[PDB]
Design a binder for these strands. Structure first.
Ligand SMILES: [Mn+2]
Ligand SMILES: [Mn+2]
Ligand SMILES: [Zn+2]
Ligand SMILES: [Zn+2]
Ligand SMILES: [Zn+2]
Ligand SMILES: [Zn+2]
Lengths: 162, 162
DNA sequence: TTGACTCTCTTAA
DNA sequence: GAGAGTCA
DNA sequence: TTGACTCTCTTAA
DNA sequence: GAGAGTCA
């Protein structure tokens, strides 16, 4: 199996390639009526994507390296976390975009957490709006807000109490 | 069935049957260090469930009625909303548990909203902790909190900025 | 060894 | 969070 | 007509 | 949010 040195070499090659991705400046809500700036390193929309990268789904990619004649492959956003525990509280760790921009591979925009923690960031009020995530959000979640509920709780008769 | 009268009759028979489900009291976090009380009307764990009800999944049920000699069937939590639009902004409307208790069929604990709005209530701080849902939450979402993130944003080299 | 495609799977609403 | 079919 | 089961599907992380 | 196969 791959040694610590070899894993570090994979992480270094990945950072070197992703660093050359187009860097896109995005203005984003931080919460509390404030605006901030994130710099996303975005994988191209179509091939070629960069050395070692290939698209396996509409917004899914993989990173591949061949070491000592053995092909190794990882989810494209998982590479920064190859030296980290891969589960916690009995839940699989997932790459989680703090910038909510799937094409971005900036490791400063990623964290490594359960799928539930990951999803929940979609509704976070943001780092200036009351975020309580221990690994703080970089921005207000895209789905934060009052929502668009069509109908609320209601009854026709008198069979129920809240 | 097609007629408003037939729909109201479906809603009324559904409410009468559900009104006979056992009422279970649940004490719940509201946010802000406060606690409240909900009264859930819980479908039985095993057959028989009640007139018109049958289980199609571990925590999925359907309500069925014969109208004009034809069988009509609905997801068991959708019946209160049969007179409401079934989509919003091009997204399917879903029955959404404000009590986060799938067996509960209390319509005073249900709303009708997109799957995204529905999911997002899992992380809401709650009605006394800052909920901004226009149709207000009845409790703090069960997944609200700091999370259990294993690793935060990081880079080995100097190629990235936030 | 490498790129560019292909397929199906996980989770919890 | 859903829809629909098989049996009795 | 009603009940009690079976199966697969949707969505967006 | 994932893993793995095929072909050249
Ligand atoms: Mn995410
Ligand atoms: Mn829900
Ligand atoms: Zn980014
Ligand atoms: Zn947050
Ligand atoms: Zn309830
Ligand atoms: Zn809320």
């Amino acid at each position: 199996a791959l040694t610590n040195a070899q894993i570090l070499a994979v992480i270094d090659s990945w950072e070197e390639t992703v660093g050359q991705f187009p860097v896109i400046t995005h203005h984003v809500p931080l919460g509390g009526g404030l605006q901030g700036t994130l710099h996303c390193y975005e994988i191209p929309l179509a091939a070629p994507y960069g050395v070692g990268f290939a698209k396996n789904g509409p917004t899914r990619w993989q990173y591949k390296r061949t070491i000592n004649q053995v092909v190794h492959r990882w989810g494209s956003h998982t590479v920064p976390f190859l030296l980290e525990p891969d589960n916690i509280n009995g839940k699989t760790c997932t790459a989680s975009h703090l910038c909510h921009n799937t094409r971005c591979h900036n490791p400063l925009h990623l964290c490594w957490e359960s799928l539930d923690d990951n999803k929940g960031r979609n509704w976070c009020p943001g780092p200036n709006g009351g975020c309580v995530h221990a690994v703080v959000c970089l921005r207000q979640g895209p789905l934060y807000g009052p929502g668009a509920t069509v109908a609320g709780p209601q009854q026709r008769g008198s069979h129920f109490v809240v």
